[PDB]
Write a protein that binds this DNA or RNA. Structure first.
Ligand SMILES: [Mg+2]
Ligand SMILES: [Mg+2]
Ligand SMILES: [Mg+2]
Ligand SMILES: [Mg+2]
Ligand SMILES: [Mg+2]
Ligand SMILES: [Mg+2]
Ligand SMILES: [Mg+2]
Ligand SMILES: [Mg+2]
Ligand SMILES: [Mg+2]
Ligand SMILES: [Mg+2]
Length: 1105
RNA sequence: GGUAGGAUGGCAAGAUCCUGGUAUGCUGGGGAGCCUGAAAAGGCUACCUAGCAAGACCCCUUCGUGGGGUCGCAUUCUUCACCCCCUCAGGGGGUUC
DNA sequence: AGCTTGGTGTATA
DNA sequence: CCAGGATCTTGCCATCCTACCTCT
DNA sequence: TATACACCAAGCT
C-alpha cells in the first residue's frame, strides 16, 4: 500500500541517539513532516558505570574462559609429565600452606639426598611454579624466554630491596626462596600488592616475570643435578603459551580486488609503492607553475630512495643533490606540513623500511643466519617479497625455503613494520609496475591497471552489513528500520542528507596553536622513536611513546609513590580508571610503580591517597605542578599548561564519576558508515543524491530559520543569563534531521562562512543567492515544526531489548547461610530457602493448599517446633538437620556451589485484579536468573508469558498483595514492561503528583515517561522521555560555579534528575488514559496486534491468551 | 577559483574490538602463624588448591553421575507469524497505525 | 502505615 | 595491568577524481 | 555528541 511522494531523509547520528526525519517536499519547499523521531539508544553500552559495551564485556568474559580452558589443559599436560618423571604434584588439600614455597626454597638451597623426598619436593615446586609462572611477552617463544636475562632487572631490584629491608642475603635469592623465608619469618605477609579498599607492607612490588621463574627453575635444576632433557621438557611444559593470532576475516579487503586481503606495511611491494607514489606526486617549479618530474628525474629520485640503508635523504637533499635543482624551494608539492626555517624541506623522504631492517638484522646476526644472508643476497625482489609476506603474515590464524630451524626461529623473531595498507600485494605490485613503466601517478595507474574510469569509487557496504562497532551498529539498525518503514509508506526518498561529525570553524590562533602542537608532537615522537629503536624496540606503540615521555618527564620515578622505576616494571595507570570510562588520552595516563598502581586499583585517586599511607595527594599535585616547561618537548607551552591542569583535575577527584571527556569518534564513524550504506541503498533504489553537511551548518541553519528548541517545545528557561542549548529537549535530534533535509551545498557554504565570522568575533543576516533561495523555500518550516510539536508528533522513542541474553546473575559468589528445621522460621528465612523442594515443602507447611509463599519478612511464621519433620521426595529432614539458605533476603540463585544475586530485571509482568472501575495492579519483576532457573532460556519460549515456578526469585520477592491475588484467582497478567518502554499519560498528564514531582510538573508537564527500572516490588522508575539527564547534570555541575545563575525551574530540574520519578506502581497504572506506547520505526505507535510489540492500555488490556 | 565529498601516501590525536597472558578478587575444599578459646571450635592475617556465568553440543568405554574436545553474556521488536538476503537447516535483515 | 527520600554495593587492574 | 594484531574516525600536508556555487 | 539500578534503611506527617 505504498503511496509515492517526493520526500527527503534526514539523518543526525549520535553517541546515544539518532534523529531521523522523512520530510515531504513540493519543488524545494518543505510540505509535510511525514515522520520525525529521536531514537535514544545505548550505544551498545552494558554496565553503565563503565563505558564498556556489551560486545566488549562478552569478549572479555570469553577470553577469560579461553584463558582458564588453556590453563586447565596446560596444567593437565604438566601433571602427565610429572607422573612420567615420578614427581608428586602438590595436593589439593591436607598440606601446609607453605609446603610449595619451602619446597622451592629447599631445592634452590640444598641438594636433597633422599630420592623420594627430592622427587616429591620437585613435583610440588614445579606444579606450583606452573600455577604461578609470572608474565612474559605472549608473542615471544620459549627460546626467546631462555634468551632473556635471568633473573630480570625487576627481580634484581626487588631482591636488593628485600635484602635492605630484612637485612639478610638469601643465595641465589630466588622468588620461591624469598617467599618461603618471608612467610616463615613474617607470618601473614602478602606477597603481591592488592586493592586497598588491615593494611601491611607486601613482600614484592613489581610484576613477576617468567625469566625470574625460569631462573629459579635453572637454580633448582643445578642444585639437584637434573638432566638437561628433563629440565627442557619441564620448561616447555611449565611456560607453554598459545601464540596470539589475527583472524584473517577481521583483516580488511582490497577495494580494487575484494578477494585479496589488504597488504601489511612490511611488504616490499608497499615500500616500493609508497616511494614511487610519493615521487610521482612531487612537482618542479616551471614558470610560475608546477610540472611533474620527468621520467629520468623520477627514476633517479626513486632509485636514490629505494637504495637507502638509512633514512638520511631529506626533501632538501632530493631537491639539491638528486634532482640538482638550483634552489631548495624549486621542488614544490612536498608532502609535508611546512614550518619555520623550511621544516617541510628538512623532513625525510620515505625509504624501504623492511629492506633496511632486514639488512640491519643480517649484518647484526651474521653468525646466526649465513644461509638466509646468502639467500637474501642471491634472490630477486619477487621472491624477497614472497618471503617477506610470509614473515608478515606469520601472525595470521589462517616458508618456501628448506631452512635450518634455528635460522627460521631467528628470522621469525625479527620485527618488521606492522599495520595494513589500503591495497593488496598484487595491486601494489601492478600499480607500481604501471607507475614506473609509465610516467604516471596512482590515479592513472589505477585507471590503466584495473580499467577504471575517472568516476571510480571503492565498493561500499550494504545497509544490512554491520561494522562491528557497537555505536555505529546501533545507529545503523535504527536507520535501516526507519528507512524500510519509510520506503514502504512513501517510496524511496528523493534525496538523503547525513550530518557528518566534522568542523573547521576555528580562530586563527586556535589553528596556529594546533599546527604548533602537531609540529611539537611529530618532533618529539621522532626523537623518542629514535631513542627507543636504539634501545632495541623496533616499532613503538602510542603507549610506548607515552611511557617513554612520562619516564623522561618524571625522571623514572613513580608519579604517585615517588619510587624509582624502569621501562620494564612501570605501569601506565588510567588516573580515571577504565571501569569509570577513563580514556586513553595521555592526560589520563600516569606512569606508576606497579605496586603503586595495584594499590590504587579502581578507586578514585584522592580517595585512595587519603586512605593510603604510601602516597600523599598534595605531594602528587605539587609534583605535577612543579613541572617546568623546557622549550624542546612534546607539548607546546599552552598544551603543557592544559595537560598539567587536566592531570591535576583527574588526581583531585574523590567519588566514582564518569569520564569528563566525550569522544566524538563513534559519532564520526557512525555518520561516515551510515553515509556509505545510504549511498549503497540509493544506488539500489535510484535516489538522486546522498548529501552530507557538518553539524555547525545544522546549528547555523537552525539559528537563521528562527528554530529555537525552547520556543518550539514551550520550554521554560533554566538559566538566569542567556538561553539554554538544544540539549534540554531530546526532540532536538529529530528537529536537526528535519533542518538537514533543507540544506543545499551553496547555503551550507554561506552558513559556514557566517559561522566562521561569528566564531572569530549584531548579528548580520547572510547575503547569497543560495541563502536567499533557501530562506524563501524554508519560510514555512518554522510553522510546520510548531504544528508538528503541537500535535505531539515528534516522537522520542527507546528501542526495546526483548532478548533474554546477558548476565544471568551478579558475579560475586556468596556463602550460604544455614537454619535448623526445629527452630522458629520468620518470613525472610522461609523466603531465603535455597532448594526448590525444601522451599515448596516449607510453603506447604505454612499454607497447605497454597502454591505460593505469602509471608511478611518480619512475622514469626513457624514456631520452634522441636518435632518438625519434612519428608522430601528422596529423603527426610528431621529437626536437627540444617537447611541451606541464601545469605540475604533478596532475589538470589544457586551458582557453582555458592549464591549469586540476580542481575538487573529483564522485564516486569503486569498483573491486574479487582473491579473494572478501580483495578489493582502489581508487577512481577523477572530477571534473567528467573528464566534460567525456570528452564526458559531455550528454543520456542515466549519469556514474557511463560509460567515461572513459585520458587523463582520473581515469585519469592513479588509483593504480598500480588501473591494473594494470584492465588485467589483474581490477578491476571495483562501485559509486560521492559526497561525503555514508553508510558504516555495522555493530554490529562500526571495527576498523582506528591512532593517534588508536583514542583517538577509545574514547570515541566511531561506526559511521556520512560521505564528505567523496577527498584522494589511496589515501584517503577520513570524518567521523562523528552528531557535529557545530561542537561540537568551539567546544571548540577555549573551550580557550584556561579551564584544563582539557574532559574528556579532549572534548580527543580537539577534536583529531580537523575533519580527522577521513583513511582508507586499502583499510583501509575491507576491513571485512566495511561497507555504503554510501543512505537514503530517511524515513531508512530503500534496499535494493531500483529507479531511485533503493540501499544496497550493497562486499564482495559485483556488477560494474556 | 572557492566550498564540499571521495582516493592514495605521510604526520598528529583518539575511538572500537580481537588474540594471548599476568596478578588480585569471590566461593568451595584446606592450613602456616597468631588470637580468642579448650573437659566447650571458631575467628583474623596470609598462603595452597579447585572452580569462576546457569549451561549446550560431540566423542568416550581400559563403563561412568565421570574423562576429553568445541563452545556459551555481541548482532536491542524474545518466542511465534509473514516477507527478504547469504550460506546447508544455520546465520542475518525488515514488518508501515 | 505506607509512600518520600537518601545512601550504597556492584569483580578488577 | 602487559604485548600486539585488526577495523575505523578527526585534523593537517601532498596528489588525483567528482559536484556545486559565485564574481569577472 | 553520552554517561544506574536494585536493596536497605530512616523518615515526618
Ligand atoms: Mg548532530
Ligand atoms: Mg594460563
Ligand atoms: Mg601464572
Ligand atoms: Mg599476593
Ligand atoms: Mg590503574
Ligand atoms: Mg543529534
Ligand atoms: Mg587466588
Ligand atoms: Mg593464595
Ligand atoms: Mg565451566
Ligand atoms: Mg528479530
Amino acid at each position: 500500500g505504498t503511496v509515492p511522494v517526493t520526500w527527503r531523509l534526514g539523518v543526525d547520528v549520535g553517541e546515544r541517539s539518532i534523529g531521523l526525519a522523512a520530510v515531504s517536499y513540493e519543488e524545494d519547499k518543505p510540505k509535510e513532516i511525514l515522520a520525525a523521531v529521536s531514537w535514544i539508544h545505548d550505544g551498545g553500552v552494558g554496565d553503565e558505570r563503565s563505558g564498556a559495551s556489551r560486545l566488549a564485556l562478552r569478549g572479555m568474559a570469553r577470553r577469560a574462559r579461553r584463558l582458564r580452558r588453556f590453563r586447565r589443559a596446560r596444567l593437565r599436560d604438566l601433571d602427565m609429565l610429572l607422573s612420567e618423571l615420578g614427581w608428586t604434584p602438590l595436593p589439593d588439600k591436607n598440606v601446609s600452606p607453605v609446603d610449595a614455597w619451602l619446597a622451592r626454597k629447599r631445592l634452590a638451597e640444598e641438594y636433597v639426598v633422599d630420592e623420594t623426598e627430592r622427587r616429591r619436593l620437585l613435583g610440588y615446586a614445579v606444579s606450583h611454579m606452573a600455577r604461578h609462572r609470572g608474565w612474559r611477552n605472549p608473542w615471544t617463544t620459549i627460546k626467546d624466554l631462555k634468551n632473556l636475562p635471568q633473573p630480570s632487572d625487576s627481580w634484581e631490584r626487588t631482591r636488593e630491596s628485600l635484602e635492605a629491608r630484612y637485612s639478610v642475603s638469601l643465595e641465589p635469592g630466588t622468588v620461591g626462596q624469598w617467599a618461603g623465608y618471608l612467610l616463615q619469618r613474617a607470618p601473614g605477609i602478602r606477597l603481591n600488592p592488592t586493592q586497598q579498599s588491615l593494611s601491611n607492607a607486601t613482600a614484592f612490588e613489581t610484576r613477576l616475570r617468567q625469566e625470574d621463574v625460569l631462573w629459579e627453575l635453572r637454580c633448582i635444576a643445578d642444585v639437584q643435578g637434573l638432566p638437561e632433557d628433563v629440565v627442557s621438557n619441564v620448561i616447555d611444559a611449565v611456560f607453554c603459551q598459545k601464540r596470539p593470532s589475527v583472524p584473517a576475516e577481521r583483516i580488511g579487503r582490497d577495494p580494487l580486488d575484494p578477494s585479496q586481503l589488504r597488504a601489511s606495511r612490511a611488504c616490499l611491494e608497499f615500500q616500493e609503492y609508497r616511494i614511487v607514489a610519493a615521487v610521482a606526486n612531487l612537482r618542479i617549479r616551471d614558470g610560475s607553475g608546477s610540472r611533474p618530474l620527468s621520467l629520468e628525474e623520477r627514476n633517479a629520485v626513486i632509485e636514490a630512495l629505494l637504495a637507502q640503508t638509512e633514512r638520511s635523504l631529506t626533501w632538501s637533499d632530493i631537491a639539491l643533490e638528486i634532482l640538482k635543482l638550483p634552489n631548495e624551494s624549486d621542488l614544490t608539492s612536498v608532502p609535508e606540513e611546512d614550518g619555520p626555517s623550511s621544516l617541510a624541506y628538512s623532513q625525510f623522504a620515505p625509504f624501504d623500511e623492511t629492506s633496511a631492517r632486514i639488512a640491519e638484522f643480517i649484518a647484526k646476526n651474521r653468525r646466526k643466519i649465513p644461509t638466509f644472508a646468502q639467500w637474501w643476497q642471491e634472490q630477486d625482489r619477487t621472491s624477497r617479497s614472497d618471503l617477506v609476506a610470509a614473515l608478515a603474515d606469520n601472525s595470521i590464524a589462517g616458508l618456501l625455503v628448506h631452512l635450518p630451524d634455528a635460522e627460521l626461529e631467528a628470522l621469525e623473531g625479527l620485527a618488521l613494520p606492522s599495520g595494513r595498507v589500503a591495497y593488496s600485494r598484487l595491486t601494489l605490485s601492478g600499480l607500481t609496475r604501471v607507475m614506473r613503466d609509465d610516467g604516471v601517478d596512482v590515479h592513472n595507474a589505477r585507471k590503466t591497471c584495473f580499467g577504471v574510469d575517472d568516476n571510480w569509487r571503492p565498493p561500499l557496504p550494504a545497509l544490512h552489513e554491520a561494522t562491528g562497532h557497537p555505536v555505529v551498529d546501533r545507529n545503523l539498525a535504527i536507520l535501516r528500520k526507519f528507512l524500510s518503514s519509510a520506503t514502504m509508506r512513501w517510496g524511496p526518498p528523493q534525496s538523503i542528507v547525513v550530518e557528518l561529525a566534522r568542523g573547521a570553524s576555528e580562530s586563527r590562533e586556535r589553528q596556529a596553536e594546533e599546527e604548533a602542537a602537531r609540529r611539537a608532537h611529530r618532533k618529539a615522537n621522532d626523537r623518542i622513536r629514535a631513542e627507543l629503536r636504539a634501545s632495541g624496540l623496533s616499532d613503538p606503540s602510542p603507549a610506548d611513546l607515552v611511557r617513554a615521555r612520562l619516564l623522561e618527564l618524571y625522571d623514572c620515578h613513580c608519579m604517585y609513590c615517588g619510587a624509582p622505576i624502569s621501562w620494564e616494571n612501570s605501569e601506565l595507570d588510567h588516573i580515571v580508571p577504565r571501569t569509570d570510562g577513563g580514556s586513553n588520552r595521555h592526560e589520563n595516563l600516569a606512569i606508576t610503580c606497579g605496586a603503586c598502581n595495584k594499590e590504587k586499583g579502581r578507586r578514585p585517586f584522592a580517595s585512595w591517597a587519603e586512605t593510603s599511607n604510601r602516597v600523599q595527594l598534595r605531594d602528587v599535585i605539587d609534583r605535577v605542578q612543579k613541572l617546568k616547561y623546557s622549550g624542546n618537548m612534546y607539548w607546546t607551552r599552552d598544551e603543557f599548561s592544559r595537560y598539567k591542569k587536566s592531570v591535576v583535575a583527574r588526581l583531585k577527584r574523590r567519588t566514582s564519576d564518569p569520564e569528563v571527556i566525550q569522544s566524538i569518534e563513534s559519532t564520526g564513524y557512525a555518520a561516515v558508515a551510515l553515509r556509505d550504506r545510504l549511498l549503497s541503498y540509493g544506488e539500489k533504489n535510484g535516489v538522486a543524491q546522498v548529501a552530507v553537511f557538518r553539524g555547525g551548518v545544522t546549528a547555523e541553519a537552525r539559528r537563521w530559520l528562527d528554530i529555537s528548541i525552547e520556543r518550539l517545545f514551550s520550554r521554560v528557561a533554566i538559566f538566569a543569563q542567556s538561553t539554554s542549548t538544544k540539549r534540554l529537549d531530546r526532540r532536538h535530534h529529530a528537529v536537526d534531521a528535519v533542518v538537514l533535509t533543507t540544506l543545499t551545498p551553496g547555503v551550507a557554504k554561506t552558513l559556514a562562512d557566517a559561522r566562521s565570522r561569528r566564531v572569530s568575533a549584531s548579528t548580520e543576516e547572510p547575503q547569497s543567492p543560495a541563502y536567499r533561495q533557501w530562506k524563501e523555500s524554508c519560510s514555512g518550516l518554522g510553522d510546520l515544526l510548531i504544528s508538528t510539536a503541537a500535535r505531539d508528533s515528534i516522537a522520542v522513542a527507546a528501542p526495546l531489548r526483548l532478548r533474554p541474553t546477558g548476565a544471568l546473575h551478579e558475579e560475586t559468589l556468596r556463602a550460604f547461610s544455614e537454619h535448623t528445621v526445629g527452630a522458629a522460621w520468620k518470613g525472610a528465612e522461609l523466603r531465603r530457602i535455597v532448594e526448590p523442594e525444601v522451599y515448596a515443602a516449607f510453603l506447604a507447611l505454612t499454607d497447605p493448599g497454597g502454591r505460593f509463599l505469602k509471608v511478611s519478612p518480619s512475622e514469626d511464621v513457624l514456631p520452634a517446633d522441636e518435632n518438625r519433620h519434612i519428608v522430601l521426595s528422596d529423603r527426610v529432614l528431621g529437626p536437627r538437620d540444617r537447611v541451606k539458605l541464601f545469605p540475604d533476603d533478596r532475589g538470589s540463585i544457586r551458582v557453582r556451589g555458592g549464591a549469586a544475586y540476580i542481575a538487573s530485571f529483564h522485564h516486569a509482568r503486569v498483573f491486574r485484579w479487582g473491579s473494572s472501575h478501580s483495578p489493582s495492579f502489581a508487577l512481577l519483576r523477572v530477571s534473567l536468573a528467573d528464566l534460567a532457573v525456570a528452564g526458559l532460556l531455550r528454543d520456542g519460549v515466549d519469556v514474557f508469558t511463560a509460567e515461572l515456578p513459585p520458587w523463582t526469585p520473581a515469585w519469592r520477592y513479588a509483593s504480598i498483595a500480588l501473591v494473594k491475588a494470584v492465588e485467589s484467582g483474581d490477578a491476571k497478567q495483562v501485559g509486560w514492561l521492559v526497561p525503555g518502554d514508553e508510558l504516555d499519560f495522555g493530554p490529562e498528564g500526571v495527576t498523582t503528583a506528591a512532593g517534588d514531582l508536583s514542583m517538577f510538573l509545574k514547570y515541566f508537564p511531561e506526559r511521556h515517561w520512560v521505564v528505567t527500572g523496577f527498584e522494589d516490588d511496589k515501584r517503577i522508575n520513570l524518567k521523562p522521555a523528552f528531557l535529557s539527564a545530561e542537561q540537568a547534570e551539567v546544571l548540577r555541575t555549573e551550580r557550584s560555579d556561579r551564584p544563582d545563575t539557574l532559574t528556579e525551574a532549572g534548580e527543580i530540574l537539577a534536583q529531580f534528575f537523575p533519580r527522577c520519578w521513583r513511582a508507586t506502581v499502583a499510583k501509575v497504572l491507576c491513571h485512566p488514559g495511561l497507555t504503554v506506547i510501543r512505537r514503530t520505526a517511524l515513531g508512530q505507535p503500534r496499535w494493531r496486534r500483529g507479531h511485533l510489540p503493540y501499544s496497550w492500555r493497562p486499564w482495559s488490556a485483556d488477560p494474556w491468551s
